[PDB]
Design a protein around this ligand. Structure first.
Ligand code: HEM
Ligand SMILES: C[C@H]1CC[C@H](C(=O)N[C@H](Cc2c[nH]c3ccccc23)C(=O)Nc2ccncc2)CC1
Length: 409
């Protein structure tokens, strides 16, 4: 029996609006590393199956991620929490993007799309993203103080997506406005936003992009050496998946990496001098922007002595796995030189491992270089405001003094 409150649910958005449940994950790793998280009827975040297995250890997250024949992404999608009254069809519509497909459909799409994430493809974005990062940090520093999320974290992930796709400069504002409405949450600050309508507008825009382009886009829509290509429709769903996979994730890694530097000033001093490229992985481990994704067992499977049954969901808590005391040396220390760094912030190794990981790391290293260049003495003004979501670990706002000159308490 682990020591938790009765009825505790690790996917409860009301927890994450205030804090990460770090103590509770540490209790599970220690005492019940695979634990049945029951959910009362009508309180399952859109799932009506009585609860899920909480997976808290890094080795178990890797084993589930490897065995995608047993642990399905398609069956229930991979997001483990929606509003409790969501219609089943709105969970199943996720199946149109590759993250929520199984083999064979997933395998074909992943092989085709991997073309867009070659070393050359990602490297071709470096210089424009470096220039853009420099101006973002300089403009924020010139403002003196402001919301770090909006003025520092937000723009570069969006420009990385826009650059990868070759989106015309004049269309970036509208693309960014759709993208910022599309990853749903349950936060009252965004309750009036409709993610469906924006997703639909982005699909239309992308299908036309495919029509007109007829960089990475040409490669994806033309037959490759094994004869495969995206239809315009599949290209539309590919663009939607980038808009949701690569926006708030990287953005939250930037905000929480800065929050870590503020908490660990010796690491920030070391970073500013040395700018180690290993920093990006430690920032992703520390930030764990996706707290959890799930799978559904398609057959009975014994996982580390626990008998998972056909049809049951398993929720991989990357936030727990990334602090696994058996894997990391002193996981509760932020160490920008950590190497190796076998974190699962981009997933456990397997078929769905984040295809954007190198682009995310480049975006993170470029923005931190620019922050070091333009605002080396930044200090926070007030505590971060966290996002109400049961699976995304988000920071909505964080007021900072970029100059470090204002008085602090
Ligand atoms: C720090 C930022 C990021 C984090 C933490 C993150 C995390 C993840 C995770 C956890 C998964 C699922 C892995 C699995 O199920 O094993 C994933 C998949 C994916 N990510 Fe990322 N990601 C980030 C940035 C990006 C970026 C910048 C892009 C592209 C612009 C991107 C594109 C994708 C795509 C297309 C998938 C689906 C892959 C598949 O299903 O085969 N991600 N990411
Ligand atoms: C046409 C169809 C609409 C649903 C799209 C989708 O799956 N969006 C969901 C959030 C979500 C889940 N169910 C939905 C229903 C409507 C609108 C949004 C959602 C989403 O934001 N997913 C996500 C996955 C990985 N990383 C970050 C975010 C894929 C394309």
């Amino acid at each position: 029996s682990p020591n938790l409150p009765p009825g505790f649910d690790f996917t409860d958005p009301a927890i994450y609006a205030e804090r990460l449940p770090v103590a509770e994950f540490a209790e599970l790793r220690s005492a019940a590393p695979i634990w049945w998280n029951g959910q009362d009827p009508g309180k399952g975040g859109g799932f009506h199956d009585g609860g899920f297995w909480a997976i808290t250890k890094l080795n178990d997250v890797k084993e589930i991620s490897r065995h995608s024949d047993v642990f399905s992404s398609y069956e229930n999608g991979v997001i483990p929490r929606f509003k409790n009254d969501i219609a089943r069809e709105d969970i199943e519509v996720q199946r149109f993007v590759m993250l929520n497909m199984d083999a064979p459909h997933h395998t074909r799409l992943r092989k085709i799309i991997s073309r867009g994430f070659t070393p050359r493809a990602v490297g071709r974005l470096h210089d424009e993203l470096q220039e853009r990062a420099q101006k973002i940090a300089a403009e924020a520093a010139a403002a003196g103080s402001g919301d770090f999320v909006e003025q520092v974290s937000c723009e570069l992930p969006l420009q990385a997506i826009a650059g990868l796709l070759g989106v015309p400069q004049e269309d970036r504002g509208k693309l960014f406005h759709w993208s910022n409405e599309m990853t749903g949450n349950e936060d009252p600050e965004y309750a009036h936003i409709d993610p469906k309508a924006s997703s639909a507008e982005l699909i239309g825009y992308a299908m036309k992009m495919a029509e007109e382009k007829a960089d990475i886009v040409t490669q994806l829509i033309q037959a490759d050496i094994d004869g495969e290509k995206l239809s315009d429709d599949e290209f539309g769903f590919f663009v939607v998946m980038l808009a949701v996979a690569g926006n708030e994730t990287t953005r939250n890694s930037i905000t929480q990496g800065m929050m870590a530097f503020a908490e660990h000033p010796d690491q920030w001093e070391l970073y500013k001098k040395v700018r180690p490229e290993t920093a990006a992985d430690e920032i992703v481990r520390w930030a764990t922007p996706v707290t959890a994704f799930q799978r559904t067992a398609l057959r009975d499977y014994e996982l580390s002595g626990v008998q998972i049954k056909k049809g049951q969901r398993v929720v991989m808590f990357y936030r727990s796995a990334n602090f696994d005391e058996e894997v990391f040396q002193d996981p509760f220390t932020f160490n920008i030189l950590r190497n190796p760094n076998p974190h699962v912030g981009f997933g456990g190794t397997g078929a769905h491992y984040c295809i954007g990981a190198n682009l995310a790391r480049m975006t993170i290293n470029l923005i931190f270089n620019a922050v070091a260049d333009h605002m080396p003495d930044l200090k926070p003004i007030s505590a971060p405001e966290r996002l109400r979501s049961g699976w995304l670990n988000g920071i909505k706002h964080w007021q900072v003094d970029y100059t470090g000159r204002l008085p602090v308490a």
